[PDB]
Amino acid sequence: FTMDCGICYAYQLDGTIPDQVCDNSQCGQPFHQICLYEWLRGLLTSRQSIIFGECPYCSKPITLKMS
Amino acid sequence: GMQRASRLKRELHMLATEPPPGITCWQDLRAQILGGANTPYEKGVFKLEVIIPERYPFEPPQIRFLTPIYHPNIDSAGRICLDVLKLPPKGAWRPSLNIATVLTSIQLLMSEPNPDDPLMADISSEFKYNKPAFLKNARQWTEKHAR
Ligand SMILES: [Cl-]
Ligand code: NA
Ligand SMILES: [Zn+2]
Ligand SMILES: [Zn+2]
């Protein structure tokens, strides 16, 4: 048992797994790097240095480090 | 577009195994919402068109009524005025939503019209100032086109 990405509903995507977990303890939704990035990049509230945006579930701050 | 497929793979299976009450959706996509009890659309069957865009789920589904319906937020062409059907900041779509929830939202919209977000100004005014007249018209519209 292991959990699907909260965005694409799949476990494996391009050989990656949903290892991007929401900071918020009241949420904790897992995401693929690819999926979370694809969603955040189009959001006006996002910032990039590493990328910051909102959890697509709880709307709380979320941090995504690309590799 | 691997994400579009994985979404549809799970959503279609779930829509087939445990769909929202009064709602069905099957492979473009076809959706059906049964008219709710204690609504003027009761005993009406409403067919819908559900187009899944290439960038789904990063973009909202495109849903229109195929069945004519008499409603303040739904035009004669089946177009639906609903925030979850549009991207931010103007809209409220996000990947946490899906086909089932959007359809449920449409089902809820049918039960509780939004007079503050009218697509049909005439129908919208009637809903506010002559509820019974609106209900009467919606009933007849349902009998004529939805069954
Ligand atoms: Cl699902
Ligand atoms: Na849409
Ligand atoms: Zn994913
Ligand atoms: Zn979250």
Author numbering:
A (entry chain Y): 303 to 351, 354 to 371
B (entry chain B): 0 to 26, 33 to 152
Please quote the authors directly.
In order to obtain high-resolution data to observe the interface, we fused human Ube2T to the C terminus of the human FANCL RING domain with a linker between the proteins. Subsequently, we determined the structure for the E3-E2 pair, the FANCL RING domain (residues 299–373), and Ube2T (residues 1–153) to 2.4 Å resolution. In complex with FANCL, Ube2T adopts a typical UBC-fold comprising a four-stranded beta meander, flanked by an N-terminal helix and two C-terminal helices. The interface between the RING domain and Ube2T buries a total surface area of ∼700 Å2. In common with other E3-E2 structures, the interface consists of a conserved hydrophobic interface between Pro62, Phe63, and Pro100 of Ube2T and Ile309, Trp341, and Pro360 of FANCL, as observed in other RING-E2 structures (Bentley et al., 2011; Dou et al., 2012; Plechanovová et al., 2012; Pruneda et al., 2012; Yin et al., 2009; Zheng et al., 2000). However, the hydrophobic surface of FANCL is extended by Tyr311, which is involved in pi stacking between Arg6 and Arg9. Further analysis of the interface reveals an extensive electrostatic and hydrogen bonding network between residues Ser5, Arg6, Arg9, Arg60, Arg99, Ser101, and Asn103 of Ube2T and Asp306, Tyr311, Glu340, and Ser363 of FANCL, with additional main-chain interactions with Ile309, Cys310, and Tyr361 of FANCL. In particular, Tyr311 of FANCL, which is a highly variable residue in other E3s, acts like a key in a lock, pi stacking between Arg6 and Arg9 of Ube2T. Additionally the nonconserved Asn103 of Ube2T further anchors Tyr311 of FANCL into position.
FANCL is a monomeric RING E3 ligase (Cole et al., 2010; Meetei et al., 2003), which specifically interacts with the E2, Ube2T (Alpi et al., 2008; Machida et al., 2006), for the strict monoubiquitination of FANCD2 (Garcia-Higuera et al., 2001; Timmers et al., 2001). This monoubiquitination event is key in signaling the recruitment of downstream DNA repair factors. The FA pathway is required for DNA interstrand crosslink repair. Using the Fanconi Anemia pathway exclusive E3-E2 pair, FANCL-Ube2T, we report the atomic structure of the FANCL RING-Ube2T complex, revealing a specific and extensive network of additional electrostatic and hydrophobic interactions.
